[PDB]
Coordinates of C-alpha atoms in Angstrom, one line a residue:
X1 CA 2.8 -135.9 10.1
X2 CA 2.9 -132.1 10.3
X3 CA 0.8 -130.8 12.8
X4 CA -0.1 -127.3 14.7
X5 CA -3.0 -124.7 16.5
X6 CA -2.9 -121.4 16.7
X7 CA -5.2 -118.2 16.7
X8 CA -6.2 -116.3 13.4
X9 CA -4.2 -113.4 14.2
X10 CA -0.9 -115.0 15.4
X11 CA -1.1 -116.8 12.1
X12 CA -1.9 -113.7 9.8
X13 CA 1.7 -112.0 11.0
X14 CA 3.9 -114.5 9.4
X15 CA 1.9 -115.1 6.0
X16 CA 1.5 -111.5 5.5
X17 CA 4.9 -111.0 5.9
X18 CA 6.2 -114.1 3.6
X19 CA 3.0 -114.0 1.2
X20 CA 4.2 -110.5 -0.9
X21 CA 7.5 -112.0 -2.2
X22 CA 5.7 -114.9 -3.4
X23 CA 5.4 -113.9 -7.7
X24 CA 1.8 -114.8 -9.0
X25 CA 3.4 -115.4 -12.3
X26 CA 3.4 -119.5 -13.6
X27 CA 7.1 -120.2 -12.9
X28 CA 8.2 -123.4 -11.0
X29 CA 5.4 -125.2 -9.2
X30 CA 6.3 -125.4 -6.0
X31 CA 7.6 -121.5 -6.2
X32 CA 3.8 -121.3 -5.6
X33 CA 4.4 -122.2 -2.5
X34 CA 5.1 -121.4 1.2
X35 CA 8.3 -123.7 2.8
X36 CA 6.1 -124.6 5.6
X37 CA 8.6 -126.0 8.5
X38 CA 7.4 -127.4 12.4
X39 CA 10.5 -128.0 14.6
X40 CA 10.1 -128.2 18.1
X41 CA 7.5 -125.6 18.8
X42 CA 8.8 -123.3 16.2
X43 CA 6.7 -122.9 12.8
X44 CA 8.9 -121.4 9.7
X45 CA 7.1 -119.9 7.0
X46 CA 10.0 -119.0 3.8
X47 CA 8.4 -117.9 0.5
X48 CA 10.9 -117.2 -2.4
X49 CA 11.2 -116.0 -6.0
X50 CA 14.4 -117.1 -6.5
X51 CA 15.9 -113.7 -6.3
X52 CA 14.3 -113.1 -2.9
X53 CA 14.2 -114.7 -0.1
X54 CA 11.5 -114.2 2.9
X55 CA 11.6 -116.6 6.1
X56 CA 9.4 -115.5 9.1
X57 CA 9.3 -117.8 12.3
X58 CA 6.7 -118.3 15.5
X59 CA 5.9 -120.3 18.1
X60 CA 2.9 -122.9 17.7
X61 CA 2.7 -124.7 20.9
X62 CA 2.1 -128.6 21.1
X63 CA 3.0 -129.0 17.3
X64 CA 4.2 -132.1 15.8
X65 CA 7.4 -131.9 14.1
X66 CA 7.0 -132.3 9.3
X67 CA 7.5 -130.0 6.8
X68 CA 5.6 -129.7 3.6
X69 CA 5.2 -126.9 1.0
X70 CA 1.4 -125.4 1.0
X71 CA 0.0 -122.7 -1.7
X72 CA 0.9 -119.4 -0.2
X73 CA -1.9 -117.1 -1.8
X74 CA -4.4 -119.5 -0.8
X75 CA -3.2 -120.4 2.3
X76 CA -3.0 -116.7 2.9
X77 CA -6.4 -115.6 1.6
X78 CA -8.2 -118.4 3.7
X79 CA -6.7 -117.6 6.9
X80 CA -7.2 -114.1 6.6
X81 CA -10.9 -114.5 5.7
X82 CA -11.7 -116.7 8.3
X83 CA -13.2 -115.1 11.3
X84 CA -12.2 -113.0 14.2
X85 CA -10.4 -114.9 16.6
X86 CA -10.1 -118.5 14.7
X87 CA -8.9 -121.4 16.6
X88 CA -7.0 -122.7 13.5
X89 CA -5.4 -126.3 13.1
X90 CA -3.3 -127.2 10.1
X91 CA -2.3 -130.9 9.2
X92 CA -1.1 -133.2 6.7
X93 CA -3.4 -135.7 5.2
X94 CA -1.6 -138.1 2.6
X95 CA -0.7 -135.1 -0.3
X96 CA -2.9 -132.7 0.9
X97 CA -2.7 -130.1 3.9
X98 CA -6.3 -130.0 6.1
X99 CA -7.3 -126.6 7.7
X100 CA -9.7 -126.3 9.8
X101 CA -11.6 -123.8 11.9
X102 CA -15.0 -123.7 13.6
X103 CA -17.1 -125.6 10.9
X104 CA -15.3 -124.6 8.1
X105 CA -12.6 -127.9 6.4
X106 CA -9.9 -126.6 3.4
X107 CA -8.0 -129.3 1.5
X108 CA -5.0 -127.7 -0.3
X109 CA -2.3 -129.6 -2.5
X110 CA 1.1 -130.0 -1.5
X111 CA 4.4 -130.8 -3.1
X112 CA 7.1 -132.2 -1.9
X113 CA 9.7 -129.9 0.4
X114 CA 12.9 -131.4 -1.3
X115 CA 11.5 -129.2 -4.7
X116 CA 11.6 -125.9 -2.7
X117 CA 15.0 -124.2 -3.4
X118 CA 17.4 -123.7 -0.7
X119 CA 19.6 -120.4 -0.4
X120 CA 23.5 -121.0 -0.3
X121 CA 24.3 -119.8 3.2
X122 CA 25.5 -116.0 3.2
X123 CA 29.1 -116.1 4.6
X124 CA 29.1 -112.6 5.0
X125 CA 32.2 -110.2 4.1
X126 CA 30.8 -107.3 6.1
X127 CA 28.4 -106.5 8.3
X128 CA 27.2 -102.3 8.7
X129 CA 25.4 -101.5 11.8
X130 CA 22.6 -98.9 10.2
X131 CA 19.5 -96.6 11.8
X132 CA 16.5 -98.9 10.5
X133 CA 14.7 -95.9 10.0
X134 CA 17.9 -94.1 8.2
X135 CA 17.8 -96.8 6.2
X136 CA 14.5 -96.7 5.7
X137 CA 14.5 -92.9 4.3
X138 CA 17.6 -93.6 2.6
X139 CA 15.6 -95.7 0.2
X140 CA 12.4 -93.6 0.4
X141 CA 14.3 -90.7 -1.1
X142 CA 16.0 -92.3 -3.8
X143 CA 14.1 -96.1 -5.3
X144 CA 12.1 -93.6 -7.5
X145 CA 14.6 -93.5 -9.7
X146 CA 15.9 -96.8 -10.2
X147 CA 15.1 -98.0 -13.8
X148 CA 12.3 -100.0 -15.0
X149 CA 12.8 -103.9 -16.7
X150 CA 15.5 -102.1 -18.2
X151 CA 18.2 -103.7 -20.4
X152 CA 20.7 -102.4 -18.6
X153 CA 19.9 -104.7 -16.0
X154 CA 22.5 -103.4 -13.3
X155 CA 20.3 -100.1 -13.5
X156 CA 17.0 -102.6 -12.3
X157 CA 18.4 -101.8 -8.7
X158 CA 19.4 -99.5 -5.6
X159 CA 23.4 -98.6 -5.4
X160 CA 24.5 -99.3 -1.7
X161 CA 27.8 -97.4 -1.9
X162 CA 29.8 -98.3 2.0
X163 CA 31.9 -95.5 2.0
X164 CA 34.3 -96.1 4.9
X165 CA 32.3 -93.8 7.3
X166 CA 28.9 -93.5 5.3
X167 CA 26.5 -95.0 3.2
X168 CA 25.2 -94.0 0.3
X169 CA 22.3 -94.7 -2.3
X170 CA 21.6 -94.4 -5.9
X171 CA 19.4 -94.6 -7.7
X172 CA 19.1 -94.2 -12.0
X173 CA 17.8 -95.1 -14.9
X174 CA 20.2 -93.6 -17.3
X175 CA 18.1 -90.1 -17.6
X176 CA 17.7 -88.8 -13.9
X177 CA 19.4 -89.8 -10.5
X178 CA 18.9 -89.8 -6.5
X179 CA 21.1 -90.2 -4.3
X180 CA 21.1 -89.9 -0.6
X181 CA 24.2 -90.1 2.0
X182 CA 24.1 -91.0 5.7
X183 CA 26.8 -90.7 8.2
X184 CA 26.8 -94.0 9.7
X185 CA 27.7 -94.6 13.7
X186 CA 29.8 -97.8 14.2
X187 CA 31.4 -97.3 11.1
X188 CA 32.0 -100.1 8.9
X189 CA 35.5 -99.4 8.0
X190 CA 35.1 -100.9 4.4
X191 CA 34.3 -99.6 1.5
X192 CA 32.0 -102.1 -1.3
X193 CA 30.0 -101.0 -3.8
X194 CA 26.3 -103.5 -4.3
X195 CA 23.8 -103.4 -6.2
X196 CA 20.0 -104.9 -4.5
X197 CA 18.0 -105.4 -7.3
X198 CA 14.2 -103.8 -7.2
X199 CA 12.3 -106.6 -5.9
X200 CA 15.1 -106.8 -2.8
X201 CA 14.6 -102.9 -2.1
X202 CA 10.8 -103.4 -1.8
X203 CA 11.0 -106.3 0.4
X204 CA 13.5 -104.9 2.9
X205 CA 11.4 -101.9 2.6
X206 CA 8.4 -103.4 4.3
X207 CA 10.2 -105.2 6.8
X208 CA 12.4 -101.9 8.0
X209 CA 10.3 -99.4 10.3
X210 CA 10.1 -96.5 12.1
X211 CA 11.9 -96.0 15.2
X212 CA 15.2 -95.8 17.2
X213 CA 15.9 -99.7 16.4
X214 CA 19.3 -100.5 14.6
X215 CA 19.6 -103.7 12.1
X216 CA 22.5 -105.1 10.7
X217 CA 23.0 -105.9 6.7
X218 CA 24.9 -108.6 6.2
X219 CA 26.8 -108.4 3.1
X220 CA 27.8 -111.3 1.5
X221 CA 29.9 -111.6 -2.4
X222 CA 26.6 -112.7 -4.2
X223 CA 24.0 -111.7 -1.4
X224 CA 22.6 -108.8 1.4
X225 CA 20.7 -110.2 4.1
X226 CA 18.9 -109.0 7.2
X227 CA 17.4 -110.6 10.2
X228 CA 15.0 -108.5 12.3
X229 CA 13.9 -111.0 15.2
X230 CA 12.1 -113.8 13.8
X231 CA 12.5 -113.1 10.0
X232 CA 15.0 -113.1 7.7
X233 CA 15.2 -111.0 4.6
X234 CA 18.0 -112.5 1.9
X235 CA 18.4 -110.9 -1.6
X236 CA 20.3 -111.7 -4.2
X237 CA 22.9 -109.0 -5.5
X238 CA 23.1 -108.3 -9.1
X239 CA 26.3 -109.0 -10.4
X240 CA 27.3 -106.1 -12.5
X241 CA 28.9 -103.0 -12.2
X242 CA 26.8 -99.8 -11.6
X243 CA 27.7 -96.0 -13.7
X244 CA 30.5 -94.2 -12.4
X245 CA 26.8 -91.9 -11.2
X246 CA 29.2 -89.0 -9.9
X247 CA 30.1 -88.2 -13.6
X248 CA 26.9 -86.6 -14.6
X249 CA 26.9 -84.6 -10.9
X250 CA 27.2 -81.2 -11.9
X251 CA 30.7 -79.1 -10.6
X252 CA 30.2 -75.4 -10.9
X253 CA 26.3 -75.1 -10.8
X254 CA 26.6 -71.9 -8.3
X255 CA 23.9 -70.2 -9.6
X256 CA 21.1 -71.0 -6.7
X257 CA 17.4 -71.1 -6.5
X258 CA 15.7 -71.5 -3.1
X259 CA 12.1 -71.6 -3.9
X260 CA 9.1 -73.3 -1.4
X261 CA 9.1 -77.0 -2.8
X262 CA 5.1 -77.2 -2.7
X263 CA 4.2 -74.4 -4.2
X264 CA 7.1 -75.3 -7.5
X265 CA 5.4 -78.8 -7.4
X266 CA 1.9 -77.0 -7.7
X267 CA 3.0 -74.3 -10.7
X268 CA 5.0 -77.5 -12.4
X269 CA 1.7 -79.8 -12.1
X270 CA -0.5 -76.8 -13.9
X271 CA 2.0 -76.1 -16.5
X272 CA 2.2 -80.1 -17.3
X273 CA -1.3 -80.3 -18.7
X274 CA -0.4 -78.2 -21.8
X275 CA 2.8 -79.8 -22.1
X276 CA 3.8 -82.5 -24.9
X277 CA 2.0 -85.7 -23.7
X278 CA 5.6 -87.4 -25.1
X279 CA 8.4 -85.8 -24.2
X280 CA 6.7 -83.3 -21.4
X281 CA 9.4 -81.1 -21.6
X282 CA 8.4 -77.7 -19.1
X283 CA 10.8 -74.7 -19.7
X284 CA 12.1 -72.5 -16.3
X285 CA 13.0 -68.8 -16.7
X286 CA 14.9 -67.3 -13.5
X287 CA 15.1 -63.6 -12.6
X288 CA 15.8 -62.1 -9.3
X289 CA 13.4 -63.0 -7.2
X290 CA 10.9 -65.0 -9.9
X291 CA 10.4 -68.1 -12.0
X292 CA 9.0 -68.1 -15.1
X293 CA 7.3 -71.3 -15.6
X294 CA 6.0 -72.3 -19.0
X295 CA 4.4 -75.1 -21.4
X296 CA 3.4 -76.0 -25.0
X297 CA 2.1 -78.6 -27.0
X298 CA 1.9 -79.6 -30.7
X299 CA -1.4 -77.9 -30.8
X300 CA 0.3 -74.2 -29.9
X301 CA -1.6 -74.8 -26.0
X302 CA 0.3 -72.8 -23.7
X303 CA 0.5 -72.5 -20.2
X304 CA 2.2 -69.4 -17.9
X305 CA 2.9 -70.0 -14.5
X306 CA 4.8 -67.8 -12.2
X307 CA 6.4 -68.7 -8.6
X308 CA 8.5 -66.3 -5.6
X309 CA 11.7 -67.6 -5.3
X310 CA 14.9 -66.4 -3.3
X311 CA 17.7 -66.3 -6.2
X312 CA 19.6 -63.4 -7.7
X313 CA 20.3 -65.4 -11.0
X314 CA 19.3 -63.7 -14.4
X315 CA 19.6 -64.4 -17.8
X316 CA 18.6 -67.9 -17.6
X317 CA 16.0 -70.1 -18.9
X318 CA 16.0 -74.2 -18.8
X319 CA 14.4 -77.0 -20.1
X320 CA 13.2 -80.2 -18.4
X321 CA 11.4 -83.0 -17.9
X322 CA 8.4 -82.4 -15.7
X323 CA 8.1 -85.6 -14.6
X324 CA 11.2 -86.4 -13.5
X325 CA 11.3 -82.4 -11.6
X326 CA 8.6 -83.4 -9.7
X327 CA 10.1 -87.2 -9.0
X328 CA 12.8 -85.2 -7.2
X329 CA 10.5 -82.7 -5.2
X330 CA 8.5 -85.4 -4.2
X331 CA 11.2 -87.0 -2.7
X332 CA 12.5 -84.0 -1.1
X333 CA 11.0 -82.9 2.2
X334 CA 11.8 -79.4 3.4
X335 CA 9.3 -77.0 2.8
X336 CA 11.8 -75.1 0.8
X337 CA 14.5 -76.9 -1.4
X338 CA 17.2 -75.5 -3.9
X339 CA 18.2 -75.6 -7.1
X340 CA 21.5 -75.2 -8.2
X341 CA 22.5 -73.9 -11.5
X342 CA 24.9 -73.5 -14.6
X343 CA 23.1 -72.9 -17.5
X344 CA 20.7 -73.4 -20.2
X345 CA 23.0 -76.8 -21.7
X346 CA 23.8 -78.0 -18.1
X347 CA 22.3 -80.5 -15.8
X348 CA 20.3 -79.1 -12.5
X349 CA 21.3 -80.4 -9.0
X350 CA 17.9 -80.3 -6.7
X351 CA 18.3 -80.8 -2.9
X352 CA 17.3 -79.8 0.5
X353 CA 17.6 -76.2 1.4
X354 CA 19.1 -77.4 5.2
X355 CA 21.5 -80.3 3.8
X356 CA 23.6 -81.3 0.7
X357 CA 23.3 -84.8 2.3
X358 CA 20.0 -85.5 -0.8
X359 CA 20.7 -84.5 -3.9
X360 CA 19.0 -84.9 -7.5
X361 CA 20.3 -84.9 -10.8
X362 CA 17.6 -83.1 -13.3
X363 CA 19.2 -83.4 -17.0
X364 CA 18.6 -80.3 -19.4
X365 CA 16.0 -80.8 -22.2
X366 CA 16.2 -78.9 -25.5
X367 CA 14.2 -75.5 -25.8

């Protein structure tokens, strides 16, 4: 008996916002599906892969109470290819859903809302008050770096270290890291280590913005959630335990680089196209005041690039990855950074040139 009106538009907000956790891939049936909900006035949207959760709620005006489960891509393409300014009306018709608009009819199946999977309600354990757009370039500056599918599967995530006063992320995949620290303002008092796996760091990413708003994550043992006016963001955690990440932080590296972070990305970029398609590997020679930038490939190609740079360091030259050097300078943002320094063997540490607060791990490669 499910029932409701509403504009094009008004409808569009909540489906784009439920629609992108919604997996294309054949899993459940009804995982297919949008958890459509009418309950005096209110229309609920939820969409779910299992290990996230997206509910986004509105008001409908003169709907009839029912709840059903609707195909979400579908659902979603059809009302956002409708016309400008659609009158739409949804309804239930034996096992189908009806939606209709101007001339146009659509006919979707349904299955039943008992099949839809319910989350276990998040008694949360702690709640930290956060900056939605700290936490917003808290992620920015470090979900790079989180591993890919990978075995490990407690690296297939963002590290949310509380640390009593701050928060921190990390981010690796076993061969660079990120990591990025935030003093926080009410300050949480506890300290909990959790992991959000990928598909939970993407999803709160879209929902946070920018702005002088504050959210709250609810932290629960087995889940994070956030609620940002009418929707609800609930992710799994994964249950694991993350690297003891500070171990491969270098102690020592004293020897200091400040070079312009634009120009190093431009010379690094130009040295990578005569670099080993495989390993990529890019060598760095300091001297006062210069880098020495340099590439070859199986085929003796060889590229010489040459940079400015504020450092008094000499008798040094280091190998790395090229990709993962520029991951880090891409996710830096002054317009000069620094690197610090041991030696030739030693990990780099990459961060701002106005703040320790972002800081990459670069791991030597062999010359």
């Amino acid at each position: 008996h499910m029932r409701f009106t509403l504009q094009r538009e008004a409808f569009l907000k909540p489906l784009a916002q439920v629609v992108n956790v919604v997996e294309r891939r054949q899993t459940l049936p009804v995982l297919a599906n949008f958890l459509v909900q009418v309950q005096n006035g209110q229309l609920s949207l939820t969409g779910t892969d299992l290990e996230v959760e997206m509910v986004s709620r509105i008001a409908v005006e003169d709907a009839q109470d029912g709840e059903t489960t609707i195909p979400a891509r579908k659902l979603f393409e059809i009302i956002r290819a409708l016309p400008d300014g659609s009158r739409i009306t949804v309804s239930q018709t034996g096992d189908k859903i009806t939606v209709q608009a101007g001339r146009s009819r659509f006919t979707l199946a349904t299955l039943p809302s008992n099949d839809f999977p319910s989350v276990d309600e998040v008694e949360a354990t702690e709640r930290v008050a956060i900056g939605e757009a700290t936490l917003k370039e808290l992620i920015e500056r470090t979900a790079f770096a989180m591993a890919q599918q990978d075995v490990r599967y407690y690296l297939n995530g963002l590290l949310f270290d509380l640390r009593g006063d701050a928060l921190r992320t990390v981010a690796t995949d076993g061969h660079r890291l990120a990591l990025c620290e935030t003093d926080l303002a009410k300050p949480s008092g506890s300290k909990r280590q959790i992991i959000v796996p990928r598909k939970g760091v993407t999803e709160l990413q879209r929902l946070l913005e920018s702005g002088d708003r504050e959210i709250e994550l609810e932290v629960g043992r087995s889940h994070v959630r956030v609620k940002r006016d009418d929707v609800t963001f609930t992710s799994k955690l994964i249950d694991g335990r993350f690297p003891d990440y500070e171990a491969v932080i270098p102690i020592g590296a004293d020897r200091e680089v400040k070079v312009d972070r634009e120009a190093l990305r431009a010379s690094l970029q130009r040295a990578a196209i005569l670099s080993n398609e495989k390993y990529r590997g890019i060598r760095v020679e300091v001297s006062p005041g210069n880098l020495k930038i340099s590439a070859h490939n199986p085929e003796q190609e060889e590229a010489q690039e040459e940079i400015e740079a504020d450092t008094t360091v000499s008798d040094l030259a280091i190998g790395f990855n090229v990709n993962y050097l520029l991951d880090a300078l891409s996710a830096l943002r002054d317009e000069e950074v620094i690197i610090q320094l041991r030696d030739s063997n030693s990990s780099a540490l990459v961060r701002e040139s106005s703040s320790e607060k972002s800081r990459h791990v670069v791991m030597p490669l062999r010359l």
